[PDB]
Design a protein around this ligand. Structure first.
Ligand SMILES: Cn1cc(-c2ccc(CNc3cc(-c4cnc5cc(OCCCN6CCCC6)ccn45)ncn3)cc2)cn1
Length: 301
């Protein structure tokens, strides 16, 4: 199933969205490289596309595709993902669609290549790129993820898996929102727990998504709060030493929340606390979050 939801300004069926043939690119002008990320059914591979944006210029791109082991329903879901990406349009703070190969073979989704890879591994390596990481970087990543999230919300799009492992970093320390989806081995990632029917990122999920399967723009805002916690603790897994079980669900239902990370400015922990409000209607919108971090950046400067 396609994970990203698009709501009517009622859910829009992604198969009903259009595929603009302006994105069509010939497969024989792609030269594949190393695998950047891989799951059981899909992968993201680095590639050199020849004459994609500029007429004759070669450029590094990332290709989303499936492995030969993928069934028909997955190939359809990749086409549906390409239509959502095409519908979303362009924004600085998302991993943008550059082209696609849908004729004469399997679907290949061509997007921007972000040289630093995922933010979670970037933050983890910066514990204990040659350059050091400071508070000015973390505040900028918070600001850019929020702009990217408010862009998605403006397109009536609920991401449903916002976490540091789905945020890429590129030249200039620009954070772009992504979703590895089938390009990650969730069968071997302890952040996705088995619900008996599927593997979910429970520690990033709002109470109403765990208890009622309700994913709203507000639930996404909860996940952003968990992301801020991850980011300001330099890649620490949420709720340390607390396994996802009956005890975890009880405290979450009761109103238990994580403690402020060490590197978090007080105004930033208040942002987390408001994203974690039990009542979704009392949580800030991404548009309100952007204005808050804009104020925090000017106070710093
Ligand atoms: C709702 N909503 C969906 C999206 C969305 C969904 C799907 C997509 C598809 N596109 C991609 C692209 C990339 C990608 C691009 N560049 C890299 C570079 C990478 O690594 C390099 C660094 C290695 N390290 C260097 C030292 C050793 C390791 C890894 C991954 N990517 N990953 C995944 N999907 C796009 C957007 C956005 N919003």
């Amino acid at each position: 199933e396609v994970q990203w939801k698009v709501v009517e300004e009622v859910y829009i069926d992604p198969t009903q969205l259009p595929y603009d043939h302006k994105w069509e690119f010939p497969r024989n002008r792609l030269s594949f490289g190393k695998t950047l990320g891989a799951g059981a059914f899909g992968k993201v591979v680095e590639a050199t596309a020849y004459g994609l944006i500029k007429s004759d210029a070669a450029m590094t791109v990332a290709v989303k595709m499936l492995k030969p082991s993928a069934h028909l329903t997955e190939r359809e879901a990749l086409m549906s993902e390409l239509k959502v990406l095409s519908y979303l349009g362009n924004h600085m703070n998302i991993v943008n669609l550059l082209g696609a190969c849908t004729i004469g073979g399997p679907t290949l989704v061509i997007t921007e290549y972000c040289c630093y890879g995922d933010l979670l591994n970037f933050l983890r390596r910066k514990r204990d790129d040659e350059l050091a990481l400071d508070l000015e970087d973390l505040l900028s990543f918070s600001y850019q993820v929020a702009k990217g999230m408010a862009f998605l919300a403006s397109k009536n799009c609920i991401h449903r898996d916002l976490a540091a492992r789905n945020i890429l970093l590129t030249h200039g320390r620009i954070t772009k929102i992504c979703d590895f989806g089938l390009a990650r081995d969730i069968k071997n990632d302890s952040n996705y727990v088995v619900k008996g029917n599927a593997r979910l990122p429970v520690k990033w999920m709002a109470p109403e998504s765990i208890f009622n399967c309700v994913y709203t723009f507000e639930s996404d805002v909860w996940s952003y709060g968990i992301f801020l916690w991850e980011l300001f603790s330099l890649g620490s897994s949420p709720y340390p030493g607390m396994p996802v079980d009956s005890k975890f669900y009880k405290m979450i239902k009761e109103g238990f929340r994580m403690l402020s990370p060490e590197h978090a400015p007080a105004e930033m922990y208040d942002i987390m606390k408001t994203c974690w409000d039990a009542d979704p209607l009392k949580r800030p919108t991404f548009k309100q979050i952007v204005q808050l971090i804009e104020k925090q950046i000017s106070e710093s400067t």
